[PDB]
């Protein structure tokens, strides 16, 4: 039914959540696969690593403890659980700092630069994300604001080089302005694309933009 509950969790962060002592739970990471979990303090019943890349567990205690979930790409998080009555839950993890994937390094350095930017841009536009690119938390304030605009991040994809983002531009003003692509530049942005080829908005906020940052 619901969207999975999503959280931030920098490398080795803590987050306060609640789990159910019946109804086995699940924690899964997009872009990776969990290979270890060690959650003493409350002595969970059992652990089972699925094939998607999540981990299934269930507790029977009645007090707060800690759970250490560890990934394969050298990512380590920590969630402070609390057993409750029922209705088993599913959470999503979202590393705010992209990991390192040397396969993606050799894949990226294999080809040229401009064709690489074109590859990433078309993979963002269509939807088919390349193999080797994860999905990391969308960073705020990664672009300039030339005038009264209201940005709202949507999603981000990243690995080892050229982290890619997606934003939204809305004209909070009353008239129509000029959208020059070089206004939304910062020290670190490598490319900017306007999704619909509109030379000037009207006043309604339905314009998105893709930004290809670096050091992802």
């Amino acid at each position: 039914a619901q969207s999975p509950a999503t959280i931030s969790l920098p490398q080795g962060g803590q987050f306060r959540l609640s789990i159910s002592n019946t109804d086995p739970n699940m924690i899964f990471i997009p872009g990776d696969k969990v290979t270890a979990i060690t959650a003493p303090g409350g002595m969970l019943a059992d652990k089972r690593l699925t094939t998607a890349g999540g981990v299934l567990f269930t507790s029977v205690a009645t007090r707060t403890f800690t759970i250490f979930v560890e990934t394969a790409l050298g990512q380590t998080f920590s969630v402070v659980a609390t057993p409750v009555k029922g209705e088993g839950r599913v959470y999503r993890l979202m590393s705010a700092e992209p990991p390192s994937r040397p396969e993606t390094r050799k894949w990226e350095t294999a080809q040229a630069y401009e064709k690489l930017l074109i590859s990433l841009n078309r993979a963002v536009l269509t939807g088919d994300i390349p193999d080797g690119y994860g999905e990391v938390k969308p960073l705020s304030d990664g672009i300039r604001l030339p005038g009264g605009f209201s940005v709202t991040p949507l999603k981000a994809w990243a690995g080892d080089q050229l982290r890619a983002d997606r934003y939204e531009l809305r004209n909070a003003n009353t008239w129509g302005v000029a959208l020059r692509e070089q206004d939304f530049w910062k020290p670190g942005v490598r490319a900017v694309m306007f999704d619909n080829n509109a030379q000037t908005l009207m006043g309604g906020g339905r314009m998105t933009v893709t930004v290809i940052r670096g050091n992802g």
Binding site: P24, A45, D46, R48, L56, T58, S59, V60
Partner: peptide, 10 residues
């Protein structure tokens, strides 16, 4: 008292 019912097909 808490184990699961896990199965894999083929």
């Amino acid at each position: 008292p808490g184990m699961m019912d896990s199965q894999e097909f083929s």
